[PDB]
Design a binder for this molecule. Structure first.
Ligand SMILES: *SCC1=CC(C)(C)N(O)C1(C)C
Ligand SMILES: [Cl-]
Ligand SMILES: [Cl-]
Ligand SMILES: [Cl-]
Ligand SMILES: [K+]
Length: 164
């Protein structure tokens, strides 16, 4: 298990445009295209991202290329966030993957709340952080994924994924 395998489990793989859990046009391994309700806008985003006329369908290799870029993006963005880099750098590599997972799902900027959860993680108060992370829209709207990510923070193991 590693961040790529972890996110592949949590995001799935679909080769045609679909709507994510929030209703937003997405493709591949959780590649958000746009928040616009226009399918035509989503197809323009897709064609721009792949560099060809796709009409909303891609190959597995193309999906994996966007995924590689999106993981790389998430990591770089954590480092570029002065509010988050210290937390990331304080963690072991397994818990770092849990943090990347959250940023991938929620965004590299603009995420609301979670200051207290990040403090408890920096303090290495793992059970307390896990309780605090669940007091969230995130946990209520995507509870099975959030439970897996939270277990990863609580334990520093891959137990919630190994077997999936
Ligand atoms: S560690 C909690 C946290 C704080 C913030 C910077 C808002 N992040 O996006 C997450 C959710 C990772
Ligand atoms: Cl565009
Ligand atoms: Cl709490
Ligand atoms: Cl879920
Ligand atoms: K998804």
């Amino acid at each position: 298990m590693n961040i790529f395998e972890m996110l592949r489990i949590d995001e799935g793989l679909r080769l045609k445009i679909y709507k994510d859990t929030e209703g937003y046009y997405t493709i591949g391994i959780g590649h958000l295209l746009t928040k616009s309700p226009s399918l035509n806008a989503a197809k323009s985003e897709l064609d721009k991202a792949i560099g060809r006329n796709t009409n909303g369908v891609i190959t597995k290799d193309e999906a994996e290329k966007l995924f590689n870029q999106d993981v790389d993006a998430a990591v770089r963005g954590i480092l570029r966030n002065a509010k988050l880099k210290p937390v990331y750098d304080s963690l072991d590599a397994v818990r770092r993957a849990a943090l990347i997972n959250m940023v991938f799902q929620m965004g590299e900027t603009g995420v609301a709340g979670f200051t207290n959860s990040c403090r408890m993680l920096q303090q290495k108060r793992w059970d307390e952080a896990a309780v605090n992370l669940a007091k969230s829209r995130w946990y209520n709207q995507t509870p099975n994924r959030a439970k897996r990510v939270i277990t990863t923070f609580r334990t520093g193991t891959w137990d919630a994924y190994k077997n999936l």
